Amino acid sequence: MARCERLRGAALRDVLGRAQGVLFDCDGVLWNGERAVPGAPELLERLARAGKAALFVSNNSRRARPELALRFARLGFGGLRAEQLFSSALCAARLLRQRLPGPPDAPGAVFVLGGEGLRAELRAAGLRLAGDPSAGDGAAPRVRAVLVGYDEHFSFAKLREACAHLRDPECLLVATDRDPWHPLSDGSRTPGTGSLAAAVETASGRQALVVGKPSPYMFECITENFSIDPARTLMVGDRLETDILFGHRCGMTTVLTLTGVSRLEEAQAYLAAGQHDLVPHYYVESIADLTEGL
Amino acid sequence: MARCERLRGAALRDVLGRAQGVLFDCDGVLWNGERAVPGAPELLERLARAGKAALFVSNNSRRARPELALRFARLGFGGLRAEQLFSSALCAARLLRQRLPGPPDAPGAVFVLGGEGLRAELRAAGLRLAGDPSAGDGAAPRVRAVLVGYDEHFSFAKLREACAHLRDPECLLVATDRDPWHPLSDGSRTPGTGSLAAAVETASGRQALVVGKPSPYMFECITENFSIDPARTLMVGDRLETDILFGHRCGMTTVLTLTGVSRLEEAQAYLAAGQHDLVPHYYVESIADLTEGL
Ligand SMILES: O=c1cc(-c2ccccc2)oc2c(O)c(O)ccc12
Ligand SMILES: O=c1cc(-c2ccccc2)oc2c(O)c(O)ccc12
Ligand SMILES: [Cl-]
Ligand SMILES: [Cl-]
Ligand SMILES: [Mg+2]
Ligand SMILES: [Mg+2]
C-alpha cells in the first residue's frame, strides 16, 4: 500500500522506466501563477524523448481548451497538442452532452454558474445555455441542468435562481469540481467551486454530480479517445484530496509534489490514521526531481 | 423518551396545566408570511389569561427588534412587550459584544454579510462594523469577526473578502443560524443563512460558531434576564432540525406543529432510526389545537 516514500535513486529509475505515461495536474505542479517550476519544462521534453506519454488533467474550469493551451506555451511547455489537455470545463461539457435528460425533439438548456471560458466550452460541445437568445418569439427552453463552476460573479440572486430550477427533481445538479479554495501569488486565497457548490447543495437539498478529480468520471473523460493503462501510468499532483485520491480510485501510482497546496505533514498524518486512499505512493520536492530517473 | 404523540384530551390539559411558559418559533408556527395561523392569536391571549409566560425565539436575522414587533401586531398578536422577542440578529449582537477578542483600548470591527436590520441590531449593541466611517484620517480598524447572516446581496467578492479576514486565526467566524432554505408564499424557496455559511466555511476552512437554534447559546441569550425553568417550558416549532433539537438540548418538552417546514413523516422516520433528539415529544396540526387545554 502507499507509504509516501521520497522517490529517488534506483527506485526512481525503476518507477519511471516502467511507466508508459504520466498524468500531470497543472497549478502547483508545472507552475505557480505565471512562474514555471524550474526544471519542469525540461522534464516534459525528456519524457517525450523517452517515448513516454504526457497528459494534463486540471480541475480549473476558467479556460476553454484554446486558451488553456496558451498558458502552457508561454511558461516553457512547448510542442503540446490540444488533445493532451483535459479540464473540468471540457469534461463537464461532455458529461452534460452525454446525460442531459429530456427528449431529442426539444433539447434542454443548462443554467451555468461560471465564466465565459466555461460557457464557451459548453457551447462547443453543442449545449444550449439558459439566457442565450430564444428562437423567434418562442418561450425560453426548459432548464434541465444546473452547472456550478468557478463563478467570480456568484450572487444570492443566482443561487436563488439555481434553486428554482432544481425544484424539478429531473433537473440535474452538476459541479465542475469541489476544490474549496486556491492560493494566489500574493499569499491570499480565492474561493473555489467547492464553496459555491456547497451553497447550492445546501439551499436546494441536493447532492451534486462532480465531474472533476477525484471523481472517476474525469478518468473516463480523458480515456474516451486515449488508451492509457492505469497500472502503467503515474498520477502527479499537489493536492491529496483531489489528485492523490483520484489516482488511488483509478489504480494509478501516485506522486505528490510539494510545490503546491498539500504539505508532506498532511500526507504523513493520513498514513498514521490509516486513510491510505489519501496517502501518496511517493513524493518529490518538485517534479524537477523526476528528470534524473530517465 | 420522545414518542411523537398527538397532543390532545386529558394529556393536553395535563401538559399545558403543568407548563409555566411556552417558547414559540414564529415563521411556520404563528403565521405563514402575512397570513396568521387561524386561532393562533386567541391561543396567546388565553395563555396570558392563564398566567403562563410566552416568549418568541426566531432564527430570522432580517429584522431588528422594533421592526420584528410590527409583524406580530398586524397579524393579531397584541399586547406583546419587546422583551418577549428574541431573534438570531439580537442574540448574535450580544454574543459578539461578549466574545470579540482584542484589547479594550482598540475595539475590533465586525465584517457583516447581511442586511440593514441585522446591522442595526449590531450597532445598538455597541459594535462597530467594517465599512462604517473611520475616525478622522485614521486607518480602518482591525476586523476581529466575520458574521454570516441572511444576505440577499451575497456575492463572490464578499465571500473572498470574508476569507481574507479569516486568514487571521484570531478573527472569529460566527453565523446567525444554519437554516438551509425557507419556503415562500408562492411555493418557491429562498436560500437560508446556512447555505451562505456553508460557502464561507468551505472557502476559509473554518467552522462557524452558530448563534441561533439549535445552539444552546440561544437559550442562554433568552434567559440572561428571564428566569424560565426548562423542565416547565414547552418549545413549539415547525422544524425538527432546529426547534425540536433545540428543545431536547435545553431539556424542554417539544411540540411540533405541522403548519410549517417539517412533516410528520420525517419525525416518525427519525424515531424509527432511533434519533430521539430529532423526535418531538408531541405534535399538533396547528397551535390552535393547544387552546382547548387551557
Ligand atoms: O496558483 C494557483 C491558482 C489556482 C486557481 C484555480 C482556479 C481559479 C483561480 C485560481 O489554483 C491553484 C491550485 O488549485 C493549486 O493546487 C496550486 C496553485 C493554484
Ligand atoms: O414563510 C416563511 C419565511 C421564512 C424566511 C426566513 C428568513 C428569510 C426569509 C424568509 O422562513 C420560514 C421558515 O423558516 C419556516 O419554518 C416557515 C415559514 C417561513
Ligand atoms: Cl446560464
Ligand atoms: Cl461590514
Ligand atoms: Mg493543483
Ligand atoms: Mg419556523
Author numbering:
A (entry chain A), B (entry chain A): 1 to 294
Quote the study's own text.
Pyridoxal 5’-phosphate phosphatase (PDXP), an enzyme that controls levels of pyridoxal 5’-phosphate (PLP), the co-enzymatically active form of vitamin B6, may represent an alternative therapeutic entry point into vitamin B6-associated pathologies. PDXP is a member of the large family of haloacid dehalogenase (HAD)-type hydrolases. HAD phosphatases are Mg2+-dependent phospho-aspartate transferases that consist of a Rossman-like catalytic core linked to a cap domain. 7,8-DHF binds and reversibly inhibits PDXP with low micromolar affinity and sub-micromolar potency.
We additionally obtained two co-crystal structures of human PDXP with 7,8-DHF: one in a phosphate-containing and one in a phosphate-free form. In contrast to murine PDXP, 7,8-DHF bound to human PDXP with a ratio of two inhibitors per homodimer and well-defined density. Interestingly, the orientation of the inhibitor was markedly affected by the presence or absence of phosphate. In the absence of phosphate, the inhibitor is flipped horizontally, with the hydroxylated chromone substructure of 7,8-DHF now located closest to the Mg2+ ion (compare left and right panels). Inhibitor binding in the absence of phosphate is primarily stabilized by metal coordination and hydrogen bonds, as well as polar and non-polar interactions. The 7-hydroxyl group of 7,8-DHF is involved in an octahedral Mg2+ coordination, albeit with an elongated oxygen-Mg2+ distance of 2.7 Å, leading to the displacement of a water molecule. The 8-hydroxyl group of 7,8-DHF forms a hydrogen bond with Arg239 and His182. The ketone group of the inhibitor participates in a water-bridged hydrogen bond to the carboxyl group of Asp27 and the backbone amine group of Gly33. Interestingly, Glu152 (or Glu148) and Arg62 can form an intramolecular salt bridge that obstructs the active site entrance. This interaction was observed in phosphate-free 7,8-DHF-hPDXP and phosphate-free PLP-hPDXP, as well as in apo-hPDXP and apo-mPDXP.
